[PDB]
Each structure stands twice: as structure tokens, then as C-alpha cells.
Amino acid sequence: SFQYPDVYRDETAIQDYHGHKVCDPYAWLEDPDSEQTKAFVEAQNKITVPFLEQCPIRGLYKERMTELYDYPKYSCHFKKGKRYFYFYNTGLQNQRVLYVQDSLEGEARVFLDPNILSDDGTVALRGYAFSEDGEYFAYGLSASGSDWVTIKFMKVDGAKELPDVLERVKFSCMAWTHDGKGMFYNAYPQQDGKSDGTETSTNLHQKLYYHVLGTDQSEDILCAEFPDEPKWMGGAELSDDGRYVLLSIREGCDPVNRLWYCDLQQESNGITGILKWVKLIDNFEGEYDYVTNEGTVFTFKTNRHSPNYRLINIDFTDPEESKWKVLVPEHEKDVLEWVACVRSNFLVLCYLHDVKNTLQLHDLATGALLKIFPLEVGSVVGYSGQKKDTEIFYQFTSFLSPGIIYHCDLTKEELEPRVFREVTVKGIDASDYQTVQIFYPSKDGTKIPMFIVHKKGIKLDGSHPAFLYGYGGFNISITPNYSVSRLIFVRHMGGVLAVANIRGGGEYGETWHKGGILANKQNCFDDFQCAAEYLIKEGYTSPKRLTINGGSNGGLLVATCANQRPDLFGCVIAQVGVMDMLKFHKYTIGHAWTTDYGCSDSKQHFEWLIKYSPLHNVKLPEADDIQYPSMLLLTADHDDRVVPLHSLKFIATLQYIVGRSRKQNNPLLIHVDTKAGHGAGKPTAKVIEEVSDMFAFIARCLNIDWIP
């Protein structure tokens, strides 16, 4: 009932990659500003939108979604100075709001409402930092979902807006020096062309500046720069005593960093230029994440010779590795997620035990286990408690639990944590659904964890629509989260939810990470393909009714699996994904992902990439009874994280190579949203629209009837 647009093929766009010749006939789609690209985007949306709204389930869904998603969304309370703050979204607000109250008992008042900044909610808060005395506040503002940030400042008492403004900020830190004179932050060199998120220009030479309040940005002090290394990025932070400036130098997305420090008492007259950095750890062999310090003895969470991480103390007066003391040895199985120091000498260790979180209280001096905090199965997605705090707050979330915030007064003999707040989403009955965690072997036998959710009592006859989700990369762990959107799939679409913790992530330490990157990248596609076969063999679903979803790095995942095993799925939703594995390093911050995929500039890497690159491996099955799965690619014009050209070229390729076939009846579509980016800061209204599209696609393609 619909035909695809004619898209010019530049058959002369041939490039040589180490003796190999590859044709990129839609390379012209790499210019966001051309009239041709604009005409192409407008045309594609001209066929997608209608098709999506033509589904009577789309409105049913959006309605249901609007009611179920309408619940109070709170964040952990956190104390800065003598006041308390917490984010709160009454329900369907575009962006959450920052509240402030002088007392846990006192009345809270609005502090910062990003909602009065843009009628549609596409201006989001991206990063904030309070001054040591909690008397001054700084926050980053992002428009249309770009990573680019604008740092503004506020006076806490009275919530007065200051005139200071910092531009050209991206992937920056925010560290105030304890004297309250200024803050450290990162910026990029003023470059030609635009800088609003629609550009594809590569970000290099990020520098470290220091901004003194009450001055103009032209006056900022350059405190660190690496002109010999364009890719390095140095984030800064102050130690608990405000005496040292710790600079973590990073290159790429690997769990490793260089560690230089600066003794602020050694600076002749303060911060007037490039600091007298001491190159403590001058290499990229391991990650060193700062926890706390006592005098010159610093406590760090590291992964050095410890794939599952551990805590170690370093004395800046005797730095020799041969002298580091192990505070909390590495666990043989559990991965030490993060650590916090609270109440002067308490350590909060959060572990990942079989894709589940656990909280324990340890002693700083010896590092001995003091207490375990009971936690049901799920994850901790919120926490507050600084070294100066005498109490802690943490938020628990699961597949059927919207979230419980717990409190614990650490100044009491009996450390009994009590429930501070508990959210519930009526219209959904947890008692009706069951969560189960299984382990299935992959092509090489490696047992892989997977979560499974569905209504109780379902008969495993492969007659149920299944939704399999996954990421698989960059040391990212997919733990239990609440998702109204997905629960409506189970309840009103009789579907089965399942999440595979395939290799490439960090569910099992760096070892797990390295098991799915560079040369072992194919391991990620095998693990995920095996999870689909498992669900099909065990009776949960059938290929014709199995949908797979992934976003960003996970978009590469599903896009690649569709290419390698199209017979295994009946629907594919790839969100803002990577498709051109040959040039991803050429745009914006793509050069950073090479530590996981490699670079096509190397003849050794090229060989791995050319084997799975979604864009270069589209091919119509030779088998007559086999066609490509229905496919929906979601992208946006301001995604400066993963440029849209990846999806643009990939779709053009699909419709030409496959869409043009006679046996192809399954639609290959794309939707390019406007005024939105990679996903962070996306307004509540745009997000309701997105899921309504995704599930309208499934229901219409798999022909699923709604269940009241």
C-alpha cells in the first residue's frame, strides 16, 4: 500500500580500505545541511508517520501509557550545606523539578524548573554541582537533546540567577574549589561552522579551564591541555579536604585512566595558569576512581589486576606500587559497582551479584564488613551520602517495583534502615506477573544470564509475542528497571519480556567486557542470537512473533542480528544505532568508541568490522520462504552522540537491496524525530509518543490484538 522513495546511488563513491574496495552510494547523506538530505528525510517520514497512526492500537496504547505513566517520580534527598534538595516530577511533567527545603520536615519550594524554559520541554538540565558550602549552584543546560552544554550559575539562598555563562562545554566536569572562588570545567576550541548538535564535526582538544565567579569566560584560566594528544579528556575533582585537584585523564571509553594530582598548597599564588601536576599514575593500564582520603593516604576503587574491581590505598608520600595496601580485596564473583564514603569513616559498597545489587557498610580503617542492607531482587538507581553526611538515602527499583527510597541515620547504635518513600502504579498488579532469571549457554558454551517476565500461569506453547532487549558493550550492565511502557506489552498485548546480559557489558567484570569487544565482538551477536533460540525452543514465543530491540550500541546489535539471522525474528526496532562501522570514528565523539570496536584505519581491525558492519552486510536471503524482518529505525536530527547518517544510509540501503525485492512484504521504515537527540533529557511528551510508535509497529506488523 506504500512505496519507498527513489534515492540516488552515487556509484562512484568507492574507497580503498587496505586493498579492499567498498562502495558507499549514499555517502551523500552524510551532509545534514544539503537539500538532498532534507528531501530524503522529509520523504521517509512521509511514509512512516501515516503507517504508524493507521494502527488503532497506537491511540489505545498512548492512552493507557498516559494513565499508567502518571505517577510521582522522586529522586533521593541530598544535603548541600544546611539545606535539602530532591528532584520531583508530579507525574506527566516534561522535565523533573529541583525542590529545596530547609528541613526534612519543612516545606519544600521549587528551586529550578526547566519546564518554564521551553514550551515543549526540549531544554534539559544536564549536570549540576554545588559549592562546598552549598551556598552557590552551577548547572548545565542542553537544548534539543544535544550533548553541547551551557553552564549557568545560581545563588542558592533566594535562588538568585547570576550573570556567569560558560559556552562550548561538552562531556565536562564541574568541580568547585573549596574557597568558593571558582569551578573547574571542560570546553572545546571555538570552531568554524555550527555547534548546535546538528553538526558532524569531530570533537578534539578538550581542555581544562577554571572559571572565577563574577568574571567573563574570556577570562577563564587554562589549567590543563594535551596538544600532542587530541583525543585525551581530563576530568577534575577536589579531594574531600579541598586540598588536592585530582585529574583523571581518559582516552576512549575503556575502564582505565591516567591519574595526575596537584597540591593546591604548592601553587605559588593559586590558580593563575597551568598547574604543577604530579603524574602519579602515568599510564592507561587500569582505572583509579577516587573514593576518599585521610591526609596523604588516598583510597581508590581500581580494576588493576582486578577485573571485578577492589579498593586500594595509595600514600602520595610513598607512591611505589610495591606499597599500595589492599583495603577490600576483589570478589571472585561479585563486581564492585561503586563506593561512597559517608559519616567520616563509613564505606558504602554496592556490588553486582548475578545482575542484582547489594549494599553493605564497611569500615574505612580496616575495610571490614559492618552491615548488609536487605534488598529484594533489583537494582539501586539512586543514592546520596557524602563524607560529611551522617545519614544515607538510596533508591531501589525492579521490574515490578517503581521504586522504594530508603533512609538510614548512621548516627545511631542500631543501623536500621527504614522506608522513606514508596511509589506504586495502580492499574498494574505485581502479583499477576512473575520474574525469573535463567542462564543459557551460548555458541561456545558460556552460560549467559537472562531475565524473563510474563503473566503468571501462561502456557509455554510459543504462541506469545516476545520482546527481547539487549545492549552488549562498553562495560554497561543492563540491570532491573521499571518500565510502564514494557509492562503494557505484557498486560495489554499478552507479551513476554526478556533481557539478555550478553557479553560486552559489565555484568561480570572487565573479563565479561573484553569477551565482547574488538575481535570477540561477534560473541555479542551469538549470545543474543542464542537467547532468541532459547525463548523459541522453551515455548515462550515463535520467530514470526519475536521482536528484538536495542538502542545506540544495542542498535548495532539488533541491526547486525537481523542481517545474520533474519529467519529468527519477525520485528526489529533499532534506536539511534551505529550502522557504519567503517567511518563511525570520523564524526563528533565517535573516535572514542574505538576501544570497543577498533578502527577501520588498521588493516587488522578492518577485517573484523567488515564482517558485521550493518551497512555493508545487507543481503537478501537466498531461500525463497525467507524475507527480512519488519524493521523500524528511530533517530533524531539533534543526536550529536551517534550522528543520524548511520540510520539514513542504512535505511536507504535496506529499501534498495531488500525493500525492492518482490518476496519482501515486511516493511523497512525509519522515523527521524525533530528537536531531540540521543535520548538524555527527552521530554515526557516526546517519550510517550516514541513507545506508542514502537509498539504500534509491532502490533500492526505481528498483527497483535489489544487486551482490555
Ligand X SMILES: O=C([C@@H]1CCCN1C(=O)CCCN1C(=O)NC(c2ccccc2)(c2ccccc2)C1=O)N1CCCC1
Among 552, 575, 653, 655, indicate the residue that binds ligand X (CB under 6 A): 552
Among 364, 599, 642, 654, indicate the residue that binds ligand X (CB under 6 A): 642
Our finding on whether 253 is near ligand X (CB under 6 A) is yes
Our finding on whether 589 is near ligand X (CB under 6 A) is yes
List, in order, residues 6 or more apart from 122 with CB less than 8 Å away: 143, 144, 145, 675, 676, 681, 683, 686
Q: Please say whether the dihedral angle defined by the alpha carbons of residues 202, 205, 211 and 216, taken in this order, is positive or negative.
A: negative
Torsion of CA 689, 642, 128, 77, to 10 degrees: 50
By C-beta, is 128 or 171 nearer to ligand X? 171
How many CB atoms lie under 10 A from the CB of residue 491? 18
By C-beta, is 26 or 471 nearer to ligand X? 471
Our finding on whether 553 is near ligand X (CB under 6 A) is yes
Min dist CB 499 to ligand X, Å, is 18
Min dist CB 592 to ligand X, Å, is 3
Min dist CB 202 to ligand X, Å, is 12
Residues 77 and 88 sit within 8 Å (Cβ to Cβ)? no
The region of 400-408, 445-453, 589-597, 619-627 touching ligand X under the rule CB under 6 A is 589-597
Our finding on whether 29 is near ligand X (CB under 6 A) is no
Hey, is 97 helix, strand or coil? Answer: strand
How many CB atoms lie under 10 A from the CB of residue 116? 11
Our finding on whether 172 is near ligand X (CB under 6 A) is no
Residues 584 and 197 sit within 8 Å (Cβ to Cβ)? no
The region of 99-107, 194-202, 437-445, 587-595 touching ligand X under the rule CB under 6 A is 587-595
For 365-389, the DSSP string reads: TT--EEEEE---SSEEEEEE--TT-
Concerning whether 552 is annotated as a catalytic residue, the answer is yes
Our finding on whether 338 is near ligand X (CB under 6 A) is no
Among 474, 534, 569, 606, indicate the residue that binds ligand X (CB under 6 A): 474
The region of 78-86, 247-255, 416-424, 445-453 touching ligand X under the rule CB under 6 A is 247-255
Give the H or E element holding residue 594.
helix 594-597
Residue nearest ligand X, CB atom distance = 592
Our finding on whether 517 is near ligand X (CB under 6 A) is no
Cell numbers for 70: 502518571
Catalytic residue among 164, 639, 673, 693: 639
Binding to ligand X, residues 202-221 (CB under 6 A): none
Beta pairing class for 546-551 and 571-575: parallel
Residues 153 and 166 sit within 8 Å (Cβ to Cβ)? no
By C-beta, is 98 or 589 nearer to ligand X? 589
Distances (CA, A) of 451 to 18, 138, 438: 42, 40, 6
The region of 87-95, 245-253, 321-329, 607-615 touching ligand X under the rule CB under 6 A is 245-253
Residues in the chain: 708
The region of 246-254, 271-279, 335-343, 478-486 touching ligand X under the rule CB under 6 A is 246-254
By C-beta, is 233 or 496 nearer to ligand X? 233
How many CB atoms lie under 10 A from the CB of residue 128? 15
Our finding on whether 171 is near ligand X (CB under 6 A) is yes
For 147-205, the DSSP string reads: S-EEEEEEETTTTEEEEEEEEEE-S---EE-TTSSEEEEEE----SS--SSS-------
d(CA 55, CA 47): 14
Helices (H), 54-127: 57-68
Hey, is 25 helix, strand or coil? Answer: coil
Among 448, 536, 578, 609, indicate the residue that binds ligand X (CB under 6 A): 578
Min dist CB 217 to ligand X, Å, is 21
Q: Interior CA angle at 693 toward 63 and 669, to 5°?
A: 165
Min dist CB 175 to ligand X, Å, is 12
Min dist CB 256 to ligand X, Å, is 8
Our finding on whether 592 is near ligand X (CB under 6 A) is yes
Residues 292 and 240 sit within 8 Å (Cβ to Cβ)? yes
How many CB atoms lie under 10 A from the CB of residue 180? 13
Our finding on whether 233 is near ligand X (CB under 6 A) is yes
Among 58, 243, 250, 521, indicate the residue that binds ligand X (CB under 6 A): 250
Min dist CB 213 to ligand X, Å, is 23
Catalytic residue among 552, 613, 630, 692: 552
The region of 99-107, 290-298, 306-314, 585-593 touching ligand X under the rule CB under 6 A is 585-593
By C-beta, is 191 or 437 nearer to ligand X? 191
Min dist CB 595 to ligand X, Å, is 9
Our finding on whether 593 is near ligand X (CB under 6 A) is yes
> To 10 degrees, what angle do helices 684-701 and 484-493 make?
30
Min dist CB 248 to ligand X, Å, is 6
Site string for ligand X, 122-161 (x = CB under 6 A): ----------------------------------------
- Mark 390-402 as b/e (b = at least 16 C-beta within 10 Å): ebbbbbbbbbbbb
d(CA 632, CA 609): 23
Min dist CB 513 to ligand X, Å, is 11
For 611-632, the DSSP string reads: HH-GGG-----SSTT--PPEEE
By C-beta, is 475 or 630 nearer to ligand X? 475
Our finding on whether 174 is near ligand X (CB under 6 A) is no
By C-beta, is 367 or 598 nearer to ligand X? 598
Among 96, 641, 649, 671, indicate the residue that binds ligand X (CB under 6 A): 641
Which residues are known to be catalytic? 552, 639, 678
**Under the rule (CB under 6 A), what is the footprint of ligand X?**
171, 233, 235, 248, 250, 253, 474, 552-553, 578, 589, 592-593, 641-642
